[PDB]
Amino acid sequence: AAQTNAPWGLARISSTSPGTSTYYYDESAGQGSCVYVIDTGIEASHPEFEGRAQMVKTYYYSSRDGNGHGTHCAGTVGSRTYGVAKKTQLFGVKVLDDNGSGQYSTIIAGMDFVASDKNNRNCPKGVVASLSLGGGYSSSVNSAAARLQSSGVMVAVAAGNNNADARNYSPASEPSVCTVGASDRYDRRSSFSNYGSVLDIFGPGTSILSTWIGGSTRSISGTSMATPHVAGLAAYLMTLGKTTAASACRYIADTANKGDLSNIPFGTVNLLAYNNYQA
């Protein structure tokens, strides 16, 4: 498959090089993997999701996404048009209020929910969780992402937008999960993107076009806009049979584009996520 005039982020992960605008991928496209977008919730009624999104959990009065940020990230995972994995199931877990804030107490519940709730969902091919969030370091949250991981759920976490080493942030600093940095379209680490030993991959994180609340579609920056590309990409790869969930990070990292990015501090990997699809 080959979606033309695709978002640059999508077209990048199907490319060895920057500056194309076509997203090439196997038409399996993620059929039979699930992705848990743990964020502010999804507008399941966005036509872009084609009835593949639902809200399965919320720790707040509403399942409805008042922010858009979960909807955005769910779109990049699996919207028909803006998403990596065009046929994944999507599972919204609203652990963040409509101003994007969340107690860690809540978040952790959210993570532990996924590691059980995955036993209620049909994901023969495998399960992914895109943690489109983070805060300052906390072993409680770190260990939650590790448990989630352990449980057979490929975790993509954002490295954060503080332009710091991501060891000070959770669940970015958790060793056992896939920490995602953001790249921009001319193939530079994005200005805001955290870095360090603890990163595992970069993804498209700058000016990323995807779905938004109210049927609309906007372009916003962030490493938590990169996370879903990778999550999407894991769901793509699990469906192709190229890896399990517990090895997906190491698979993705081995298959990436080496030494592309500029403005990558010393000590951080120079890996940009790649779908390796030969068309």
Curated annotation (Swiss-Prot):
Its EC number is 3.4.21.64. The active site is at residues 39, 69, 224. GO terms for molecular function: metal ion binding; serine-type endopeptidase activity. The keyword DNA repair does not apply. GO terms for cellular component: extracellular region. Disulfide bonds join 34-123, 178-249. The keyword Acetylation does not apply. The lineage of its organism: Eukaryota, Fungi, Dikarya, Ascomycota, Pezizomycotina. It catalyses: Hydrolysis of keratin, and of other proteins with subtilisin-like specificity. Hydrolyzes peptide amides. Keywords: Calcium, Disulfide bond, Hydrolase, Metal-binding, Protease, Serine protease, Signal, Zymogen. It is an enzyme of class 3 (hydrolase). Binds 2 calcium ions per subunit. Ca(2+) 1 binds at residues 175, 177, 200. This is Proteinase K. Belongs to the peptidase S8 family. One of its GO terms (biological process) is proteolysis. It comes from the Eukaryota. Ca(2+) 2 binds at residues 16, 260. Its cofactor is Ca(2+). Hydrolyzes keratin at aromatic and hydrophobic residues. Residues 7-279 form the Peptidase S8 domain.
